[PDB]
């Protein structure tokens, strides 16, 4: 979220 972004892909 501070890395991948709120718009980034879902992740475990």
């Amino acid at each position, epitope marked *: 979220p*501070g*890395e991948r*972004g709120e718009t980034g892909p879902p992740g475990p």
Partner: antibody
Amino acid sequence: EVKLEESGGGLVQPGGSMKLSCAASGFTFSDAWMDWVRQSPEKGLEWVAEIRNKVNNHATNYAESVKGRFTISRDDSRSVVYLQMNNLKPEDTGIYYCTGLTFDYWGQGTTLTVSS
Amino acid sequence: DIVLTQSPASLAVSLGQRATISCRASESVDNYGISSMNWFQQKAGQPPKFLIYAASKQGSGVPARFSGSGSGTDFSLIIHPVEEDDTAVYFCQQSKGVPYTFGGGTKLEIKR
């Protein structure tokens, strides 16, 4: 405030090369996943390429239409992302945006025109 | 590739009314119990601006009047109340997996 600045667009002959680059500030750069997205009247918004953070091994991914020709990289020490584009074609023409935190933040864009 | 199809193509709404824009995916964008569907606003001469993520959740700092809904293949962006400044092209976009893909955009016009 977050700030992204693309550079190095312009004109180039079909078959030629071009290296775009993107300067980012306002967020922890080495943590961020960064992408390039392009926009044309013909194809709309196209995701072009992804580079992930240090934790994800700086993994890269590309759109099918650019694989083998485009390469995305980053210099975490300078807070910059590059996009090397080789063997350019007329349909590669468009506005190229550098995005940060996947698509949370967008640069103003730089224009690439492939024409003789 | 997941193909996103928007409707309507464009739309004209009066100030204070509701605008509803749809987005349909060719296959499910659900993954890890989250619908990976985002919405962007593009004003004229501007980059796209991030509004909604995970189908229904508002982006950090985004105004109250933009909200989203849906899951699986059918989603929508709702704007209520519509304002002068909301004239723009709205895109849906899918981050379930590579390649990430955008819709064709929907043009909102304000009636006056």
